[PDB]
Amino acid sequence: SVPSQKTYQGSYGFRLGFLHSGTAKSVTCTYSPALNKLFCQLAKTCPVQLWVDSTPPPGTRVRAMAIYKQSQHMTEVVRRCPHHERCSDSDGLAPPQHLIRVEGNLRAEYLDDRNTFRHSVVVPYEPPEVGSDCTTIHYNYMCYSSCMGGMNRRPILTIITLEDSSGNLLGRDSFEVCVCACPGRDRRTEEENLR
Ligand SMILES: [Zn+2]
Numbered sequence: 001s002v003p004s005q006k007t008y009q010g011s012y013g014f015r016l017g018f019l020h021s022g023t024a025k026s027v028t029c030t031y032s033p034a035l036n037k038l039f040c041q042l043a044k045t046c047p048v049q050l051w052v053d054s055t056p057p058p059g060t061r062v063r064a065m066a067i068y069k070q071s072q073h074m075t076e077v078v079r080r081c082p083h084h085e086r087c088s089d090s091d092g093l094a095p096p097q098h099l100i101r102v103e104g105n106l107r108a109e110y111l112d113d114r115n116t117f118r119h120s121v122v123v124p125y126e127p128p129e130v131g132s133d134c135t136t137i138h139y140n141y142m143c144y145s146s147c148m149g150g151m152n153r154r155p156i157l158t159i160i161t162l163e164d165s166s167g168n169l170l171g172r173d174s175f176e177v178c179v180c181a182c183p184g185r186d187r188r189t190e191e192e193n194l195r
Contacts, residue, residue, distance in 0.1 A: 081150025
């Protein structure tokens with residue numbers, strides 16, 4: 001099958017947020033609202049904010065999953081390429097085949113769906129702390145969009161779902177991702193081609 005990618009704020013008014021990092025040649029992660037696309041370097045921190053109008057129940061979780069954006073590739077499981085799945089750079093929790101990892105959260109769980117074979121990483125939803133208005137999850141993408149035998153230049157979408165303790169849908173948002181050597185220049189080039 002194919003995971004839904006329909007934006008759904010749900011009962012708790014769930015939606016994502018991104019920092020404003022700019023497009024300098026040196027930037028490691030930058031988000032383009034015009035393209036709803038995140039550009040980031042390989043295995044660098046990608047801060048993703050979680051915004052809600054009201055706090056969801058204890059036990060609520062947040063899942064991240066990648067799918068190919070192009071319909072002709074949608075049924076293919078997004079995974080790391082033959083080279084990166086074998087480079088032994090595991091952090092001791094993420095399976096080596098998984099494209100998306102969560103940084104600094106010992107409660108992250110990695111799932112290999114026994115039915116769809118798709119990969120995902122899920123963490124408990126934590127309400128914002130004192131002085132903060134949102135919660136931030138730090139993601140890492142472990143393969144370049146251009147990796148041969150892997151994404152092979154095919155664009156991907158990351159789908160973030162807010163789920164209850166049973167895995168039922170409470171909210172959903174998504175964004176395109178391009179893991180590349182120079183996020184600042186590529187974002188500028190793509191926004192130009194759009195203009
Ligand atoms: Zn790779």
